[PDB]
Design a protein around this nucleic acid. Structure first.
Ligand SMILES: [Mg+2]
Ligand SMILES: [Mg+2]
Ligand SMILES: [Mg+2]
Ligand SMILES: [Mg+2]
Ligand SMILES: [Mg+2]
Ligand SMILES: [Mg+2]
Ligand SMILES: [Mg+2]
Ligand SMILES: [Mg+2]
Ligand SMILES: [Mg+2]
Ligand SMILES: [Mg+2]
Ligand SMILES: [Mg+2]
Ligand SMILES: [Mg+2]
Ligand SMILES: [Mg+2]
Ligand SMILES: [Mg+2]
Ligand SMILES: [Mg+2]
Ligand SMILES: [Mg+2]
Ligand SMILES: [Mg+2]
Ligand SMILES: [Mg+2]
Ligand SMILES: [Mg+2]
Ligand SMILES: [Mg+2]
Ligand SMILES: [Mg+2]
Ligand SMILES: [Mg+2]
Ligand SMILES: [Mg+2]
Ligand SMILES: [Mg+2]
Ligand SMILES: [Mg+2]
Ligand SMILES: [Mg+2]
Ligand SMILES: [Mg+2]
Ligand SMILES: [Mg+2]
Ligand SMILES: [Mg+2]
Ligand SMILES: [Mg+2]
Ligand SMILES: [Mg+2]
Ligand SMILES: [Mg+2]
Ligand SMILES: [Zn+2]
Lengths: 192, 126, 136, 133, 37, 176, 23
RNA sequence: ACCUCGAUGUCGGCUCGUCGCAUCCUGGGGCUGGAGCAGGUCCCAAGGGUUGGGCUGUUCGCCCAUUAAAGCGGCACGCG
RNA sequence: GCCCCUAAGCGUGUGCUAAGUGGAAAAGGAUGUGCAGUCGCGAAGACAACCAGGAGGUUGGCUUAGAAGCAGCCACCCUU
């Protein structure tokens, strides 16, 4: 797995606080904090539009090259602050990284396939935990479902992991549960 | 329809022509899929009978010497690629036009020449 | 009609309506969900009406999740009585819903039918609400 | 130019047949006798017959082969098809019956060869849900 | 001529028009003819 | 707009006069008048064409452009050829006759009914049941044809009354 | 109910700044 | 429980009205599971009209004959 | 607060609205309109419109008087 770093421009914040953050969000700037093993907290501001586009293109766990006043720095999107209601981006958490670093990452698992018609499949574990390399973090992990019948329990173990990818979660996690499709009678019974 | 699918169709139709010895261009406006499928029974034996969009064909026809068939793309384009022998497609289309009377042959091509209805009928007879 | 089996205090103050939802703000079980936009109290009957509306629509298959339980009560005193003389007696069992909360959750193959079912559900609710999927 | 499906040894019912093409202005008795003669030259199969109608009311009967699903129902030996295809597998069909039905429907199909007809017959048996191996 | 605060295209042949500042629905079927009011 | 960017050709038997925004067209069938709106500019291409132009593509300009272009086209077509509509009636004993220029109908009412052809329009009955109307103005011809059509209430059961030829009436069956 | 509407709405006068005595 | 207890007379009925339309009749339309006759329902429409008796203090209600119809409401549940 | 009533601005610049919105109101309905943005197809000619087709298995199986692409249920298949 070899993904390209993404190039973003950051400018160091002049003021910090709720008023400064509201003002910065007002004119299209998103506040971010760069903290890592370098033990240097940088309060930065990013273009909201371009950052959002990069996130959409390359998921939540994207590797970034930030332009701190000419300096190109490798960072990772550790956390995002989204408004519960209007789905903005409120704040960003960025972790300094050097190449060849072991990274702990939540990666979304997507269920694809054609289950048997008398089957309903429920995706129970929304996202799974991976130890990998900073330059080689998947975007999605795929689970195929074909011929799955009766109660077919897919645990965290059965997900295929590429090279350099390590499963941190306990492999018991029911990522996908295959069940009998609820009946025309069963639906009228739950909740009463 | 997307441009990639059109490019793939252009390449495939070009490839099918390079495997064809000669071609016939006809008009099908005015026939149903029933008799059309019966024709694919008749023409599917040796030759190949298909239809393509003219703007797709001219990029497919610019490949070989069927660049002289650009002027026969007027009207709905039905192409008969004669692969087995030469004359089978011409006589089969002539009889299908005699029975149906709903087909008009725009022309044909082979041996470096694109040739009109009279010359096709000659080769269809010769 | 979902009624809690027992409560520690059967007569309570009104659930106060300030702020936006902190928990339950994401779709967690089904493919789709309904996100609330207003502040409200939601009773038993509204929930069962919406749930039957969904069930009638999707009909055959797919499963539904209800993320909120009407466990906070509301009392009414008998009519034709003056003010005072003690608090009333409980009648109707509600839940305090704030904007951002996810009410109903659906797992169903088809997208359009799912949206239609959730729309039928929303029309039964006293508040503005919208359909939210698990995609960001 | 209409179509009906009428059984082997049966003719002249009121609901399915009589008014069906009696409102098409076609002579019913001559059709009935001719189709009956032909189908007793078949001896064995419910047949779909297509009436080709003209302006002077002269009619021609198009006798296509007995229906593919009906041919598979008589092939698998069961009187009734399944209520839940691919779930309720009432009977079984073998590849040799598949080839015989493929020949008959080749006489009825647009299929150019035997294999296409066999694939069509497999689809037809699946449509009603009888196990094909 | 239905008159309702809601007007919707009952069948796909229905078309929605605004005449003289009010919204109505026109269709070949006179049953589907309705007005928003 | 998109229609309003197609030039209006002037046939040889046609004469055109333009006075600012006013327009007049004279041909074998007579003379007709028209006025265009302030936003729209009108020119005559010396190649025997008419050009309708707009300065802007806002709502008023876009809407008025095609309107004015089609309107002048209809105006010239009226004095070149004219306009003809056909009527044809259904029902037993439904009577149509011409008295000079005036049209008389007997559609089942106790009394017979009359309609008067206004100036610029004429009637022609060739059958007791069907006839035609000729005129210079498309709009006036359509108006009179409509008022003729309205005379008898529509019948989905037996379909009595006047009709256009091309139109088809919906019909239900009164079963009882 | 008209009168209560009138008073509660004239409370919104730009001079009253959203407050008037007696609602 | 905000005016009225150094007084603001309270039910039905009679006389006299005035206004609203959320129209009972008359008028104009749309749709019909509208053949016609006769209907159903929705929209527009306040010009005019909208009975006499038996029982009840009665309002109301039932009933008897009719009428095109025998509307509902506000005006201190109008008016001592 | 500044057109007149009524003292002071029918003030300047850039837009927006057609509803007297301004100068009352809900769920909800809706090709009004402006700004900004995402995805599709589009000269290899897109969309609309104008002309030709949309066939065979087959009336797929159950239910049914009936069920044949078009009360209903299951799969939702195959050739030219
Ligand atoms: Mg508090
Ligand atoms: Mg939450
Ligand atoms: Mg919490
Ligand atoms: Mg609501
Ligand atoms: Mg409705
Ligand atoms: Mg009130
Ligand atoms: Mg208050
Ligand atoms: Mg007092
Ligand atoms: Mg006093
Ligand atoms: Mg007193
Ligand atoms: Mg009065
Ligand atoms: Mg009214
Ligand atoms: Mg009327
Ligand atoms: Mg009416
Ligand atoms: Mg009146
Ligand atoms: Mg008057
Ligand atoms: Mg009154
Ligand atoms: Mg009083
Ligand atoms: Mg009174
Ligand atoms: Mg009183
Ligand atoms: Mg007194
Ligand atoms: Mg008194
Ligand atoms: Mg007095
Ligand atoms: Mg002054
Ligand atoms: Mg000012
Ligand atoms: Mg000024
Ligand atoms: Mg000014
Ligand atoms: Mg106002
Ligand atoms: Mg409002
Ligand atoms: Mg809405
Ligand atoms: Mg078919
Ligand atoms: Mg059917
Ligand atoms: Zn309609």
């Amino acid at each position: 797995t070899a993904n390209i770093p993404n190039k973003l421009t950051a400018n160091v914040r002049t003021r910090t606080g709720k008023g400064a953050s509201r003002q910065a969000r007002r004119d299209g700037k998103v506040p971010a904090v760069l903290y890592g093993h370098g033990t240097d907290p940088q309060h930065l501001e990013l273009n909201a539009r371009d950052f959002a586009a990069v996130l959409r293109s390359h998921g939540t766990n994207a590797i970034l090259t930030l332009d701190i006043e000419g300096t190109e720095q490798l960072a990772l999107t550790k956390a995002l602050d989204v408004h519960p209601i209007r789905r903005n981006i409120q704040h960003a958490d960025l972790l300094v990284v050097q190449r060849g670093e072991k990274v702990t990452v939540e990666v979304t698992v997507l269920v694809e396939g054609d289950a048997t018609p008398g089957t309903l499949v429920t995706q129970d574990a929304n996202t799974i935990e991976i130890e990998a390399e900073a330059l080689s973090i998947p975007e999605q992990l795929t689970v195929s479902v074909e011929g799955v019948e009766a109660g077919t329990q897919i645990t965290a173990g059965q997900i295929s992991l590429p090279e350099g990818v390590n499963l941190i979660s306990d492999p018991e996690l029911l990522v996908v549960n295959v069940v009998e499709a609820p009946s025309a009678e069963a639906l009228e019974e739950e909740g009463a | 329809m997307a441009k990639a699918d059109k490019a793939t169709a252009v390449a495939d139709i070009a490839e099918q022509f390079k495997a064809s010895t000669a071609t016939v261009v006809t008009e099908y406006r005015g026939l149903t899929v029933a008799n059309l499928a019966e024709l694919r029974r008749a023409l599917g034996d040796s030759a190949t009978y298909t239809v393509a969009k003219n703007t797709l064909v001219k990029r497919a026809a610019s490949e070989a010497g069927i660049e002289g068939l650009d002027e026969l793309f007027a009207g709905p384009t039905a192409i008969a690629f004669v692969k087995g022998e030469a004359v089978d497609a011409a006589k089969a289309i002539k009889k299908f036009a005699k029975d149906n009377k709903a087909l008009v042959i725009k022309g044909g091509y082979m041996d470096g020449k694109a040739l009109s209805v009279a010359d096709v009928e000659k080769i269809a007879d010769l | 009609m979902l009624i809690p089996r027992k409560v520690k205090h059967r007569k309570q103050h009104h659930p106060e309506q300030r702020g936006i939802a902190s928990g339950g703000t994401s779709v967690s079980f089904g493919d789709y969900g309904i996100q609330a936009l207003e502040h409200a109290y939601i009773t038993n009957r509204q929930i069962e009406s919406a749930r039957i509306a969904i069930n009638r629509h999707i009909k055959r298959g797919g499963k539904v999740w209800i993320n909120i339980f009407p466990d906070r009560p509301l009392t009414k005193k008998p009519a034709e009585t003056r003010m005072g003389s003690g608090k009333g007696s409980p009648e109707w069992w509600v839940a305090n819903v704030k904007p951002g909360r996810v009410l109903f959750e659906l797992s169903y193959p088809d997208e359009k039918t799912a949206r239609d079912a959730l729309t039928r559900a929303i029309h039964k609710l006293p508040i503005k609400a919208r359909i939210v999927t698990r995609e960001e | 130019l209409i179509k009906l499906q009428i059984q082997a040894g049966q003719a002249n019912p009121a609901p399915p047949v009589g008014p069906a093409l009696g409102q098409h202005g076609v002579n019913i008795m001559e059709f009935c006798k001719a189709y009956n003669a032909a189908t007793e030259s078949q001896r064995g199969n419910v047949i779909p017959v297509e009436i080709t109608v003209y302006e002077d009311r002269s009619f021609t009967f198009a006798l296509k082969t007995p229906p593919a699903a009906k041919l598979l129902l008589k092939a698998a030996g069961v009187q009734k098809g399944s209520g839940e295809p691919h779930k309720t597998k009432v009977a079984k069909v073998t590849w040799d019956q598949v080839r015989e039905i493929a020949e008959t429907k080749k006489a009825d199909l647009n299929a150019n060869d035997i294999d296409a007809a066999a694939k069509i017959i497999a689809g037809t048996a699946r449509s009603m849900g009888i196990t094909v191996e | 001529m239905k008159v309702n605060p809601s007007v919707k295209p009952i069948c796909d042949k229905c078309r929605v028009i605004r005449r003289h500042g009010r919204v109505m629905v026109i269709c070949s079927d006179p049953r589907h003819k309705q007005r928003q009011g | 707009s998109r229609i309003g960017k197609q030039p209006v050709p002037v046939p040889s038997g046609v004469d055109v006069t333009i006075n600012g925004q006013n327009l007049s067209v004279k041909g074998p069938k007579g003379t007709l008048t028209l006025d265009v709106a302030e936003p729209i500019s009108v020119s005559r291409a010396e190649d025997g064409a008419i050009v309708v132009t707009r300065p802007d593509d806002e709502r008023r300009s876009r809407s008025l452009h095609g309107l004015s272009r089609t309107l002048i086209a209809n105006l010239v077509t009226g004095v070149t050829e004219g306009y003809t509509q056909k009527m044809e009636i259904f029902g037993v004993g439904y009577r149509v006759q011409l008295k000079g220029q005036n049209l008389e109908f007997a559609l089942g009412y106790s009394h017979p009914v009359l309609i008067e052809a206004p100036e610029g329009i004429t009637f022609a009955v060739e059958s007791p049941t069907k006839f035609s109307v000729s005129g210079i103005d498309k709009q006036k011809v359509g108006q009179i044809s409509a008022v003729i059509r309205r005379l008898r209430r529509p019948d989905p059961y037996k379909g009595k009354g006047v009709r256009y030829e091309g139109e088809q009436i919906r019909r239900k069956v009164g079963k009882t | 109910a008209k009168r209560g509407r009138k008073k509660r709405d004239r409370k919104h006068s730009k001079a009253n700044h959203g407050k008037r005595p007696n609602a």
